[PDB]
Amino acid sequence: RVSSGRDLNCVPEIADTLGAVAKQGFDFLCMPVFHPRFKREFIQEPAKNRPGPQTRSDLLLSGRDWNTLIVGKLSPWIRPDSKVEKIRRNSEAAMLQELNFGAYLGLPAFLLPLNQEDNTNLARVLTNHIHTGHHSSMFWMRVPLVAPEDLRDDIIENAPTTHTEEYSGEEKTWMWWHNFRTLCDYSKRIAVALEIGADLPSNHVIDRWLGEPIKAAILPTSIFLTNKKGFPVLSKMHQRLIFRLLKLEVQFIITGTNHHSEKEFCSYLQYLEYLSQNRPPPNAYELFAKGYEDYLQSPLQPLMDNLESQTYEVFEKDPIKYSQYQQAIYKCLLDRVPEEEKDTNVQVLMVLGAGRGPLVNASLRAAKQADRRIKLYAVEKNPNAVVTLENWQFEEWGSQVTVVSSDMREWVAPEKADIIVSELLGSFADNELSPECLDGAQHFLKDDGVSIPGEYTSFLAPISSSKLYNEVRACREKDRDPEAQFEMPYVVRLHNFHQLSAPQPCFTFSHPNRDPMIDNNRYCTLEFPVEVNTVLHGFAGYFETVLYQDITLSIRPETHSPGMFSWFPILFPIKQPITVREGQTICVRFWRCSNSKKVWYEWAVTAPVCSAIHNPTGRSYTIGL
Amino acid sequence: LPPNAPACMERQLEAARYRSDGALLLGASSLSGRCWAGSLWLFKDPCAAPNEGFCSAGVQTEAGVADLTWVGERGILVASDSGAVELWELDENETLIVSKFCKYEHDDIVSTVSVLSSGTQAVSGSKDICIKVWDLAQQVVLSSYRAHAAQVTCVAASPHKDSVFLSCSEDNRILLWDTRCPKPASQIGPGYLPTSLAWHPQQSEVFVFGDENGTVSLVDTKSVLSSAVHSQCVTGLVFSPHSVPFLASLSEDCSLAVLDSSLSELFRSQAHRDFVRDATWSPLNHSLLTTVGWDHQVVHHVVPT
Ligand SMILES: Cn1ncc(-c2ccc3c(=O)[nH]nc(CN)c3c2)c1-c1sc2ccccc2c1C#N
Numbered sequence: 058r059v060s061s062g063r064d065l066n067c068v069p070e071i072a073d074t075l076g077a078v079a080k081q082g083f084d085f086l087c088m089p090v091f092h093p094r095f096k097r098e099f100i101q102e103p104a105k106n107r108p109g110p111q112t113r114s115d116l117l118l119s120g121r122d123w124n125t126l127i128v129g130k131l132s133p134w135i136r137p138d139s140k141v142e143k144i145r146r147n148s149e150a151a152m153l154q155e156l157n158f159g160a161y162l163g164l165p166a167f168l169l170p171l172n173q174e175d176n177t178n179l180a181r182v183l184t185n186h187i188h189t190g191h192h193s194s195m196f197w198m199r200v201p202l203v204a205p206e207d208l209r210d211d212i213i214e215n216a217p218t219t220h221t222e223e224y225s226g227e228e229k230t231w232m233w234w235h236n237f238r239t240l241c242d243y244s245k246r247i248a249v250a251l252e253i254g255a256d257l258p259s260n261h262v263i264d265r266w267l268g269e270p271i272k273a274a275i276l277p278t279s280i281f282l283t284n285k286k287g288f289p290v291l292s293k294m295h296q297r298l299i300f301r302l303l304k305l306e307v308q309f310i311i312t313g314t315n316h317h318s319e320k321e322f323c324s325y326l327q328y329l330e331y332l333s334q335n336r337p338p339p340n341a342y343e344l345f346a347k348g349y350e351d352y353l354q355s356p357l358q359p360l361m362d363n364l365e366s367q368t369y370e371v372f373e374k375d376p377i378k379y380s381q382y383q384q385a386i387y388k389c390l391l392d393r394v395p396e397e398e399k400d401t402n403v404q405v406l407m408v409l410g411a412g413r414g415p416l417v418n419a420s421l422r423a424a425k426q427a428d429r430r431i432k433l434y435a436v437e438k439n440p441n442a443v444v445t446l447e448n449w450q451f452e453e454w455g456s457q458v459t460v461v462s463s464d465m466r467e468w469v470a471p472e473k474a475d476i477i478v479s480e481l482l483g484s485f486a487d488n489e490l491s492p493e494c495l496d497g498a499q500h501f502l503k504d505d506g507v508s509i510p511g512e513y514t515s516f517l518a519p520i521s522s523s524k525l526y527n528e529v530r531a532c533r534e535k536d537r538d539p540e541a542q543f544e545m546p547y548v549v550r551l552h553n554f555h556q557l558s559a560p561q562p563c564f565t566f567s568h569p570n571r572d573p574m575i576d577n578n579r580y581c582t583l584e585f586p587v588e589v590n591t592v593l594h595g596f597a598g599y600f601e602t603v604l605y606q607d608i609t610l611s612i613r614p615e616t617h618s619p620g621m622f623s624w625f626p627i628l629f630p631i632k633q634p635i636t637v638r639e640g641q642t643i644c645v646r647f648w649r650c651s652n653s654k655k656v657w658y659e660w661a662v663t664a665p666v667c668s669a670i671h672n673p674t675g676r677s678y679t680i681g682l
Numbered sequence: 683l684p685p686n687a688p689a690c691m692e693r694q695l696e697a698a699r700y701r702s703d704g705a706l707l708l709g710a711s712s713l714s715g716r717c718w719a720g721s722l723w724l725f726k727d728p729c730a731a732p733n734e735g736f737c738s739a740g741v742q743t744e745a746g747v748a749d750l751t752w753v754g755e756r757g758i759l760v761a762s763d764s765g766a767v768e769l770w771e772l773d774e775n776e777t778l779i780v781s782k783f784c785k786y787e788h789d790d791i792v793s794t795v796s797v798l799s800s801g802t803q804a805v806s807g808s809k810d811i812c813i814k815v816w817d818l819a820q821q822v823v824l825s826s827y828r829a830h831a832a833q834v835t836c837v838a839a840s841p842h843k844d845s846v847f848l849s850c851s852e853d854n855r856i857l858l859w860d861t862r863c864p865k866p867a868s869q870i871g872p873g874y875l876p877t878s879l880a881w882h883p884q885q886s887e888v889f890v891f892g893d894e895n896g897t898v899s900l901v902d903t904k905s906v907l908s909s910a911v912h913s914q915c916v917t918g919l920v921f922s923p924h925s926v927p928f929l930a931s932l933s934e935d936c937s938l939a940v941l942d943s944s945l946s947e948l949f950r951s952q953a954h955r956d957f958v959r960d961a962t963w964s965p966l967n968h969s970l971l972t973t974v975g976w977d978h979q980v981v982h983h984v985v986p987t
């Protein structure tokens with residue numbers, strides 16, 4: 058099921074037109090709210106006194122139909138950036154008039170074009186309308202992948218078409234959009250209606266729009282091909298672009314007249330439904346991640362905060378993750394306990410941060426399949442989850458498990474462990490203070506003891522996403538620094554974004570940490586080659602961890618553990634977007650800082666331009682010890 | 683009140699063209715109100731217009747009439763809001779206006795239409811930025827040209843060269859066309875956007891064009907004379923049928939101007955109270971000049987020769 062609309066520039070009767078558009082299967086109708094040829098004068102007589110009515114009546118549709126089925130269209134004679142002053146004036150008045158009519162009617166969106174480079178005065182008028190009341194309406198800026206001047210037929214004998222590659226020139230319409238939305242100050246009500254032409258540009262032109270707020274894609278009937286049976290279809294390259302757009306769940310708009318007159322008009326739409334039904338269904342992860350796409354979440358702090366019951370539930374609903382823990386334990390048991398000692402050597406296993414019991418059960422299953430003997434301690438500081446562990450221990454585990462209600466940094470263990478097992482990792486690895494927690498527990502690990510996990514490494518990657526930048530921006534709160542939202546990380550299932558360079562390692566930790574001078578502070582400088590023109594808005598963070606030897610967990614995309622649902626990526630934003638040109642290097646700097654009470658991150662971009670140091674002294678974001 | 687003729691003519695009169703015998707063809711659009719359609723009319727008595735009860739023939743179109751032109755003496759070629767080009771034809775009795783064909787070949791409003799010398803082909807320009815050449819007999823598009831980069835404001839066939847015609851667009855291009863050339867368009871050289879075009883009737887390589895700023899200009903194929911004639915857009919330019927022709931110019935300033943060879947002003951009418959849309963010279967009385975506008979007026983000016 059695709060949500061699709063019909064684009065018309067001619068509506069003799071609204072009720073007749075709307076009925077026909079719906080019978081064909083469309084969900085909505087883009088149409089003009091004043092006759093597109095009905096030029097109006099606002100200054101000079103006698104034409105300014107043209108008797109009314111100035112357009113059709115609001116009583117021709119119910120309020121629900123205006124609210125849900127109609128997208129309005131700016132009249133095409135309206136040119137607020139004309140070089141003729143009189144035309145700029147009448148266009149300004151007319152543009153306020155049509156926009157205020159759309160608001161009067163409650164239309165859910167309104168379409169305005171970007172068809173040239175200079176739309177400064179159009180932006181000024183739109184921004185003025187936007188700051189005239191508090192409404193939820195959307196403005197769809199109709200902008201093409203390829204400017205009409207760059208796709209005209211080469212039929213002018215004395216003005217031939219440029220056949221030489223112009224990398225940035227071919228990206229010009231993205232610059233039309235960027236400047237417009239920059240002038241309009243990244244209004245959340247301003248979105249892209251991307252118009253697709255018969256010939257697609259270079260791939261880099263397409264990727265330019267990654268991370269942008271695309272709400273609709275416009276498909277002219279002119280681009281459809283024709284198969285043997287006479288039905289409209291699309292080239293394999295166009296189909297590629299459709300699939301990418303279905304991943305953004307945009308609304309598709311069919312514009313133009315029916316050029317396959319042998320077939321009824323619902324043909325074009327039926328083909329989209331055909332492309333939509335043809336694609337891999339939800340594959341467990343994507344099935345589950347959908348719903349969380351680009352949704353900002355505060356990172357959990359299981360140390361400072363006691364997690365709720367349903368939060369452990371989410372942890373537990375990932376069998377691939379714990380089967381890896383079971384394999385790590387299984388292998389370790391066999392390396393530590395030779396066959397000939399299988400009945401005499403009882404290994405002491407300590408789960409450090411057991412929550413409701415998943416590792417405890419994985420540890421038991423591991424010792425069974427390994428045919429080895431283990432003595433288990435289940436250490437958990439959250440007394441609410443200790444309730445779960447102690448009902449389990451009485452009902453099932455029995456005396457083989459000793460539940461300990463304590464902080465692993467303070468607990469005085471009655472004996473030393475052969476293996477400590479922990480799940481203290483966040484989306485950025487150490488961002489829950491696993492190093493601090495495991496350092497404080499090390500004293501009761503044997504001299505040859507093993508820690509599972511044995512090491513972990515965070516990764517970083519620059520990304521472009523004007524959508525996510527705006528989401529962060531909108532996280533201003535009343536009683537704090539008005540830019541605090543940009544000085545803190547977010548856990549988020551990154552979706553509408555462009556990764557700008559291959560992720561690279563940031564911070565690594567090993568356990569046990571034999572080193573005699575333990576310092577968990579960190580300072581790392583990274584250099585990301587960028588081969589595209591783009592805008593930098595933040596850094597995606599991931600991690601990898603070695604549980605034991607070759608058994609690992611990873612959410613780093615290029616090595617993501619297949620089938621693991623746990624852990625979305627994390628996002629470090631920056632206060633001000635940074636322009637990056639093709640071939641430039643993004644240099645970012647990250648610090649891991651601490652005092653006796655808190656740990657935090659600070660970060661900074663130093664090339665190709667310097668940003669401010671973000672989160673100095675943890676003024677906006679700290680992680681409690 | 684002829685048969686199958688609408689009892690009411692739309693307000694916004696868009697076209698007026700005399701034919702050989704002097705009958706007047708009217709084109710009308712409904713540009714506001716519940717229904718946005720249009721209509722075609724024939725007045726064998728041009729003084730009775732635009733009264734519907736005293737017309738010779740009349741019919742309703744599905745959509746508005748952005749432009750039209752005669753195709754001979756019983757043919758009417760229409761640029762429709764629907765994107766379609768339509769041909770209507772009078773019956774033998776000239777009491778009905780029957781539709782001949784209605785082809786939806788443009789993807790937006792058809793704004794301008796012009797019949798070529800041979801009278802068997804026509805060219806149309808649309809807001810979809812394309813220009814199409816039509817074979818009226820086979821009812822098919824022979825050629826589709828995307829030379830411009832923005833809407834096509836005006837196309838005008840050569841008076842006597844069946845393969846030559848002008849076009850202009852909001853991309854600031856004026857293009858001279860010759861379909862005999864492998865690349866059939868040529869750019870005729872910063873100014874204001876061109877809005878209207880008129881070939882000289884007695885001079886092969888001479889034409890005039892109007893701009894969005896009120897200027898009228900006289901151009902030769904190769905080496906310019908111009909005059910500020912209007913305070914707004916110049917909607918149209920129509921040479922008179924005199925041996926030494928006069929030049930009628932129309933404008934969104936609601937005025938009609940008549941200019942001489944050197945673009946000097948000989949007449950000026952402010953009779954209209956809304957935009958002036960078309961002007962057509964009487965074939966019978968060469969001094970009479972008829973204009974129509976969105977004020978629903980049909981004015982008959984006597985032009986002092
Ligand atoms: C916001 N946050 N910060 C850190 C996390 C998060 C996620 C999953 C795990 C895990 O499987 N194991 N251990 C941890 C920590 N030690 C964890 C932490 C999360 C959460 S809440 C939640 C609830 C529903 C869906 C997704 C998520 C999600 C993620 N990703």
Ligand SMILES: CSC[C@H]1O[C@@H](n2cnc3c(N)ncnc32)[C@H](O)[C@@H]1O
Binds near residue numbers: 439
């Ligand atoms: C599964 S998320 C990590 C788990 O480890 C627990 N935890 C985190 N830090 C400590 C600590 N220092 N001592 C004991 N349990 C901890 C948390 O309460 C949570 O159940």
